């Protein structure tokens, strides 16, 4: 059984700038409902600093992967466990600001 997951692109501030349509099955939102919003706006209060810290660290990692598990508010207003693995990309031929690529998978909080 394949995991349920979707890809997103963010600016370094955390704003969704691209969302793969697999997001509908994963978290219930249409891509247009996520675009332009910060990922932290969907984050459980206990996990908000964690997620900010994660996005800060990923920029410092200059392309290496960081992964974080946190609670994401679904379209049905339920807390879903998400594991986000992220890394930055920058076009090597220019000096465009880097952006962040995330793969976001619904996972279990279970031992």
């Amino acid at each position: 059984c394949q995991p349920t997951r979707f890809i997103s692109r963010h600016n370094i501030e955390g704003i969704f700038t691209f969302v793969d349509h697999r997001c509908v099955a994963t978290v219930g939102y249409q891509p247009q409902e996520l675009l332009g919003k910060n990922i932290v706006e969907f984050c459980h209060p206990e996990d908000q600093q964690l997620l900010r810290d994660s996005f800060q660290q990923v920029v410092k990692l200059k392309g290496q992967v960081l992964s974080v598990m946190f609670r994401f508010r679904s379209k049905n207003q339920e807390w879903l466990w998400m594991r986000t693995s992220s890394f930055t990309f920058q076009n090597p031929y220019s000096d465009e600001i880097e952006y962040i690529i995330c793969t976001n998978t619904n996972v279990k909080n279970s031992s």
Binding site: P3, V65, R83, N91, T103
Partner: protein, 116 residues
């Protein structure tokens, strides 16, 4: 090759560990002609130019060892004939719980128009 404006010629893709597409950005259709759903489950070897298959096999082995690396330049056969040059930044995504690889995430940037 054209190295200006590459952001407008960049598309994302996701792959299994055995070189199959599991996701592709719709941007590929305007650039190379394929629809994402027709790539799913299909092998990269159905699309690599014959001159590049070998190097891309070695490059994939390099990726799996380093966890992330750039591919080197290669050619993808285009849907309606000919090819485009491109290069890929690949990144292996691991399950943190057991460090097994789950998939490969790619940032692909197209370096030419369709050529014969």
């Amino acid at each position: 090759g054209e190295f200006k404006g590459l952001d407008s010629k960049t598309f994302l893709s996701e792959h299994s560990m055995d070189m199959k597409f599991t996701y592709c950005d719709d941007r590929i259709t305007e650039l190379i002609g394929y629809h994402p759903e027709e790539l799913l489950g299909r092998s990269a070897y159905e699309f690599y130019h014959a001159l590049d298959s070998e190097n891309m096999t070695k490059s994939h082995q390099n990726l799996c060892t380093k966890g992330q690396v750039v591919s080197g330049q290669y050619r993808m056969l285009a849907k309606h004939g000919g090819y485009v040059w491109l290069e890929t930044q690949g990144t292996v995504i691991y399950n943190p719980r057991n460090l097994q690889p789950q998939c490969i995430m790619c940032v692909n940037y197209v370096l030419s128009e369709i050529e014969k």
